[model samples]
Target: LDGPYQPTTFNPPVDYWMLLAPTAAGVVVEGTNNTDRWLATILVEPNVTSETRSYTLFGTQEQITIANASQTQWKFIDVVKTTQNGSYSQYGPLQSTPKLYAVMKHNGKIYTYNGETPNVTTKYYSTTNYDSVNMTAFCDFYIIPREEESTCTEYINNGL
Candidate 1:
């Protein structure tokens, strides 16, 4: 059973009931259906929601449109951004995995990597909001990948 927030209808016989946090990014309703056969995550808005700004995520490649029984929520990633020109820009709600848990900035760009990686001198960033955002920190975050540590290493090797 989902916590607190309940759907108008109960399909019953569900396996997982993890709830996605309400995000300013949009209203996300997560549920399992078909008797725990499939997991569904929906982003809704407005009263029965009208299509306006195109609630879309790049990778999915879908132009979602719904007119009723809809909802929307907030996600921290709504404000999270990638490093650009000494500031965050790319707004991918980067989360950490078991293998990765660090973020860093070099040459005015950010990078994430696995903590166990070596020969890479990367300084991870906190659950930061680009400083101007806020002062509080969240333990949950991401690690910038080291696609080519050699390039980053070369710079670090110069002794800065």
Candidate 2:
């Protein structure tokens, strides 16, 4: 969970850009910024969870144990932004979540977005490279035991 991670220009240095497939649970999730800044949302749906979870990066080898304070599935977050009191939503029939779309970078601010779309407008910056990216930095996801009813809970993180 340590980054303001930017895109890499080489192959040897592990790229932050990666891909995650969550399953047939694509739903439009939104975050309301009742506060004064922009926020990112990470969701683990079905609202069933236990224990604290830590995310370890495959390249830099940094791990962060995020708190599992309750049974709620949606996680609201953000690295940087000042879009005061606005709202954002992530929508698509994809396995990914709301945060990952702009998780890597948005207009080079690094891990910041208006939520549903990019706020930076550079001629070289396009939605194709950010949201709906073939890949992006870091992979953080969860598994729902109810979906398959299997006790073997394992997740994978592959580097390209």
Candidate 3:
């Protein structure tokens, strides 16, 4: 919405990395990417859909409405006004996604893992001296592979 928000500073900044994953629903219902990306998924069986196909594995998903579209760390390039293209198939049992990942922007370019494989981002930079964390900086946050990173940081500049 605001000319690709420029950050004021970055906090545990690290080089991007990649991860390969084959997972069950576990406990997460939704989740990120570059060019400022954000993503989500719901486990469903073929019939459960309008197709009367099958039952959704786990169950139909309760769609996740991502917040902070104006934040750099969470800026997903206007998903609210964009289309999923071929991505609808990636939500739920239809999740045949070969690659998916999230990227954070700092300074200028997007900081992503290899910019190739699918992996999640961890804002490990949000710790408060020790294990306790104050979630304020995480406002531009989204879910990703837990422990995705040991410690991560970002760099922001005031003047876009």
lDDT of 3 by residue, 36-154 (tens): 23233222221221322232222343333222212112122111101322223231111222322234333333344321112333332121221111111212223333244433211
TM per candidate comes to 0.23, 0.25, 0.21
Clashes of each: 19, 5, 23
Model 2 segments more than 4 A misplaced: 1-54, 60-62, 68-72, 76-107, 110-160
Output the better candidate (2/3) by lDDT.
Answer: 2
Top candidate on TM-score is 2
Task: Please give the range of 10 consecutive residues that has the lowest summed lDDT in model 1.
Answer: 134-143
Q: What does candidate 2 score on TM?
A: 0.25
Among all candidates shown, the one with the greatest lDDT: 1
Instruction: Tell me the whole-model lDDT of each prediction, alpha carbons only.
Output: 0.28, 0.27, 0.25
Q: Native-vs-model 2 lDDT? A: 0.27
Which of the two, 1 or 3, has more TM-score?
1
What is the per-residue lDDT of model 2 for residues 1-160, given as tens digits with 9 covering 90 to 100? 2333343222211223222232322221222232343323343443434433443222222222232233422333322223442333322211222333322233433322222212221111222213322222233322222232111111111111
- The count of backbone overlaps in candidate 1 is 19
Put down candidate 1 lDDT per residue, 1-160, tens digits, no spaces.
Answer: 1133433333322112122233223433221222212122332333443454444332223344434232231111222223221222222232211112223334423343322223433443343222222111112221223454444333222321
